């Protein structure tokens, strides 16, 4: 989601995004495209459900 008041230090926000996309599956793709839908890194073969 984009639109909230961002944090002052962009480096902290970047590290937070790295640690949040960490430990988890669904992550904004690494380049972080501007003017995009921020689709998760497109899935390979599918799942079990």
């Amino acid at each position: 989601s984009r639109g909230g008041v961002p944090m002052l230090h962009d480096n902290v926000t970047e590290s937070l995004r790295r640690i949040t996309a960490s430990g988890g599956r669904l992550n904004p793709t690494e380049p972080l495209p501007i003017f995009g839908g921020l689709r998760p890194a497109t899935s390979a073969g599918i799942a079990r459900g």
Partner: protein, 98 residues
């Protein structure tokens, strides 16, 4: 008739459902995707990486040290150069990694 093994192994650790619920020997309830989207992706659906687990995404693959191309404990296994040539084997498995 030596009714005997053929070692795989599955290092180590978690809670209580993958050797307490589902599971098998070289790693994940899965499926390389047959006929579907297309058939020239089996290097990041069968060799490199993009997402979470074809079964158990609670944590990333089976045992901390063998999950790609040309490696050891299965260096016991692969089969162009000579070990379908000098000691003939169905070998523990000859279609588990092939």
């Amino acid at each position: 008739q030596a009714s005997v093994c053929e070692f795989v192994a599955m290092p180590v650790s978690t809670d209580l459902q993958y050797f307490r619920t589902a599971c098998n020997p070289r790693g994940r309830a899965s499926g390389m995707l047959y006929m579907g989207d297309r058939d020239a992706d089996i290097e990041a659906i069968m060799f490199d990486h993009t997402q979470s687990d074809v079964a158990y995404t609670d944590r990333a693959t089976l045992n901390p040290w063998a999950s790609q191309k040309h490696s050891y404990g299965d260096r016991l296994y692969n089969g162009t150069y000579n070990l379908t040539g000098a000691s003939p084997i169905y070998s523990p498995c000859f279609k588990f990694f092939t």
